[PDB]
Structure 1
């Protein structure tokens, strides 16, 4: 885990120095209050001018011991209504796949901005959940209606 922790400490430094407005990315605590750099609690704000606007969408970023060989698993908690989000909460995205567009050099900032962009522009060619995907494909106005409601439920206080 040395190589992974070295990189994850450099990502925490870069993120604290400068990150996009409204985004959260913080390592979790181990039982003994020590920092767990392999498991981050993140939040993505809905984009201004979209049906996601107003919402803050919490997500866990989970790193394997061979990071950055492998991308993190990115998991919305709770699971999101979105065509490219598995019922588990796992995000399906090409930059989050080792055998697709993942590159070791991709930053936490680039991952979170990538997921933000996915939220309002689903990929109709890599479905992840039957429920959201079918409504997206067959009934776009009802899809956008469910998204507006979701954005209201996850409005921050």
Structure 2
């Protein structure tokens, strides 16, 4: 019951106040169930960046051990970013159970942390060779890839 109670709190908190352009909501199944353990989210790219105008889908998977353990956050498979695996998994220090996670971190803080990561990748956390290479050795090709991807995710 600890996980459910905390997710119910996060649900209310999110609905009453969240940053503009973001979406975060429990998944509705084809059977009508609404699942507090799996949330579908949308992270806007920041204005004034190559991510601008993109609205990027992300799924947050909580466990019965939340909030002792962090959710798993996934962009779509093949999403282009140096810190995102091919599977879509996002690498973020605060999502790391071994070191950065603390139970008090909110869903809002996670999604803002991911939004920040989009235009400011972490050079120590390379997850995919494609993004990471272009980022490190060919910024012009990287920039073109990012802007093309933003166009794939309009509001």
Please indicate, yes or no, whether the TM-score normalized by the shorter chain is above 0.5: yes
Name the structure 2 match of 1:84: 83
Name the structure 1 match of 2:70: 71
1:146 Cα deviation (Å)?
0.5
Query: Structure 2 regions of 5+ residues with no counterpart?
Result: none
Q: Which runs of 4+ in 1 moved over 4 A?
A: none
User: For each residue in 1:56-78, what CA deviation from the matched residue of structure 2 results, as whole angstroms up to 9, or x when unmatched?
Assistant: 00010000110001110000024
Cα distance in 2, alignment partners of residues 79 and 39 from structure 1: 20
TM-score, with normalisation over the residues of structure 1? 0.96
Name the structure 1 match of 2:127: 128
TM-score, with normalisation over the residues of structure 2? 0.97
1:134 Cα deviation (Å)?
0.8
How many aligned positions are there? 155
1:16 Cα deviation (Å)?
0.1
Does 1:103 find its partner at 2:98?
Answer: no
1:109 Cα deviation (Å)?
0.3
Provide the alpha-carbon RMSD of the alignment: 1.0
1:31 Cα deviation (Å)?
4.6
User: For each residue in 1:79-131, what CA deviation from the matched residue of structure 2 results, as whole angstroms up to 9, or x when unmatched?
Assistant: 41000000000000000111121110000000000000000000011101111
8 Å contact kept, 1:58–1:78: no
Cα distance in 2, alignment partners of residues 48 and 27 from structure 1: 27
- 3-state SS, counterpart of residue 42 of structure 2: strand
Cα distance in 2, alignment partners of residues 34 and 57 from structure 1: 24
What are the within-5 Å matches in structure 2 for residues 12-31 of structure 1? Answer: 12-31=11-30
